[PDB]
Design a protein around this motif. Sequence first.
Motif, PDB file in Angstrom:
ATOM      1  N   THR A  56       0.756  -1.181   0.016  1.00  0.00           N
ATOM      2  CA  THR A  56      -0.344   0.060  -0.069  1.00  0.00           C
ATOM      3  C   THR A  56       0.732   1.249  -0.207  1.00  0.00           C
ATOM      4  N   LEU A  57       2.193   1.293   0.199  1.00  0.00           N
ATOM      5  CA  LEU A  57       3.016   2.253   0.194  1.00  0.00           C
ATOM      6  C   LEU A  57       3.444   2.720  -1.234  1.00  0.00           C
ATOM      7  N   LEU A 103       1.249 -11.102  -2.717  1.00  0.00           N
ATOM      8  CA  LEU A 103       2.732 -10.234  -2.967  1.00  0.00           C
ATOM      9  C   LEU A 103       2.872 -10.498  -4.493  1.00  0.00           C
ATOM     10  N   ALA A 104       2.775 -11.395  -4.985  1.00  0.00           N
ATOM     11  CA  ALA A 104       3.222 -11.361  -6.514  1.00  0.00           C
ATOM     12  C   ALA A 104       2.297 -10.447  -7.379  1.00  0.00           C
ATOM     13  N   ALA A 105       1.065 -10.354  -6.955  1.00  0.00           N
ATOM     14  CA  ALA A 105       0.160  -9.390  -7.635  1.00  0.00           C
ATOM     15  C   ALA A 105       0.807  -7.862  -7.461  1.00  0.00           C
ATOM     16  N   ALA A 106       1.339  -7.710  -6.434  1.00  0.00           N
ATOM     17  CA  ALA A 106       1.958  -6.358  -6.135  1.00  0.00           C
ATOM     18  C   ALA A 106       3.038  -6.172  -6.842  1.00  0.00           C
ATOM     19  N   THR A 338       3.876  -4.907  13.617  1.00  0.00           N
ATOM     20  CA  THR A 338       4.204  -3.634  13.080  1.00  0.00           C
ATOM     21  C   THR A 338       3.808  -3.315  11.433  1.00  0.00           C
ATOM     22  N   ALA A 339       4.160  -4.452  10.769  1.00  0.00           N
ATOM     23  CA  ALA A 339       3.557  -4.286   9.404  1.00  0.00           C
ATOM     24  C   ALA A 339       2.013  -4.167   9.281  1.00  0.00           C
ATOM     25  N   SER A 344      -2.572  -0.457   8.385  1.00  0.00           N
ATOM     26  CA  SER A 344      -3.966  -0.003   8.696  1.00  0.00           C
ATOM     27  C   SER A 344      -3.817   1.516   8.647  1.00  0.00           C
ATOM     28  N   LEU A 345      -2.740   2.109   9.143  1.00  0.00           N
ATOM     29  CA  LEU A 345      -2.512   3.697   9.103  1.00  0.00           C
ATOM     30  C   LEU A 345      -2.471   4.241   7.973  1.00  0.00           C
ATOM     31  N   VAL A 346      -1.885   3.588   6.887  1.00  0.00           N
ATOM     32  CA  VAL A 346      -1.775   4.071   5.538  1.00  0.00           C
ATOM     33  C   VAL A 346      -3.041   3.992   4.789  1.00  0.00           C
TER      34      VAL A 346
END
Length: 352
Positions: A56-57, A103-106, A338-339, A344-346
Motif C-alpha cells: 500500500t506504500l 505479494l506476486a500481484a503487487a 508492526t507491518a 492500517s494507518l496508510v
Amino acid sequence: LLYPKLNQLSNSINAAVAFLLEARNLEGWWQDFNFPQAASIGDEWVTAYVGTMLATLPYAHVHEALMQAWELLKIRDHRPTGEWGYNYILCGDANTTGWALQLAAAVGASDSERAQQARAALATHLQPNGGIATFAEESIRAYIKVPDLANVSFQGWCGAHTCVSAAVAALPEFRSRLHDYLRVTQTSQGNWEGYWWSDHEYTTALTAEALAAGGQAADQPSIEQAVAWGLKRLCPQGFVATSKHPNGSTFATAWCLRLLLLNTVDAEVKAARAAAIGWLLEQQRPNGSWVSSAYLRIPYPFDRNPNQFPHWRYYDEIEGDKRFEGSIIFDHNSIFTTATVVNSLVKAAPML
Ligand SMILES: CC(C)=CCC/C(C)=C/CC/C(C)=C/CC/C(C)=C/Cc1cc(C(=O)O)cc(O)c1O
C-alpha cells in the motif's frame, strides 16, 4: 482536518517502514514467530504477509524491497506442489501460498509460471463445504514426528479454515468460488471466527474485504453487520480490548481499523477510525515498532473448533513441561504486528 495529525501519521508510518526495512535478515527475509527446538522461525509466510502489508506504500524503495521479497520466494522452489510454507523445513500450506500470491500481484508477477503453479496448488485445498484447508493431511503428518500425535485425527488442521479462506478470497481467481462459504460462516453478531488466530478482527476484516471486492449488492448487508460489530469492538479510547490486553491489542485494533474502512459514510464509524488512529499513534515505540500482539494459536490436530477450546495458554509463560498444542505464540520480533499497524494507518489516513 488537523494537519499536525496528518503529519504525525506520515512520521509514524515512515518510522515503522524504516524499522521493517532494517529488520530484514542477511538475504533479505522478514522473520517472525518461533517454535523453539522444533519448526523454528517463520520466513516465507512472514515475508509474504509483510510484503503484502507494505504494498500500500507509494515508495520506490519499498517497491524494491517487495521485488526482492518475491525473488526470495521464487528461490523457495523445493516443494513439488509449488506451494510456500511457514519456512523451508515445513510442507506447503494454503495460507502462506495465498499471501505469497497477493505479494506476486503487487510486483506484477500474478501471471508468472510460479504464481500459476501455486494458484493451481491452492485448488487442491478446496473442501466439500466450499472453504480452503490449511494443510494436506499426508504432507503435515509427514512433517510431525510426535509419538502421542501419530494416531490422532488431523481433521482440525486439514479442514476448512475461515481465516485462510478469507485470505485466499483476496485473489480474484478464488473470490467467486469461496463466496458462499464466507457468507454462511458469518456469526449472528456479524463477525467471523478464525482457526489459527485468537483475534476475530483479523478474519472479520479479511472476509468483509473479500465480500466488498466482489461488488455484489447482496453482500453489502453482511459487510455493514461486520462494520457494526467492529464499532462495538472498538472502545471509546480507540482500541480493541482483549482478555490478554485489556488496555488494547495493537494487532486487533489495526485489523478493526481496516474493517471500519468498509463504511465511508457513517459519522460514528469515521469518529471511531479517528480514535483508533490516535491510540495507535500514542502506542508506537521509539524505534518505530509496535508491541507484539499477533497471537497465533496451535490447536490439537484433531480440534475442529479452537474457538470452543477454553484451555489456551501463552507458550512463553508455561512453567515446566510444555507442548505447542493448546498454546499461543506471538511475533517476538514485532515485525508481523508492526507491518499490520502501518498498513492500517496508510489505508485509514485519507479517510481522516
Ligand atoms: C496458517 C497460518 C496462520 C500461517 C501460515 C504458516 C502456518 C502453517 C502457521 C500455523 C502454525 C503452524 C502449524 C506452523 C507450522 C509449524 C508447526 C507444524 C508448528 C506446530 C508444531 C510443530 C512441531 C515440531 O516442529 O516438531 C511439533 C508439534 O507438535 C507442533 O504442534
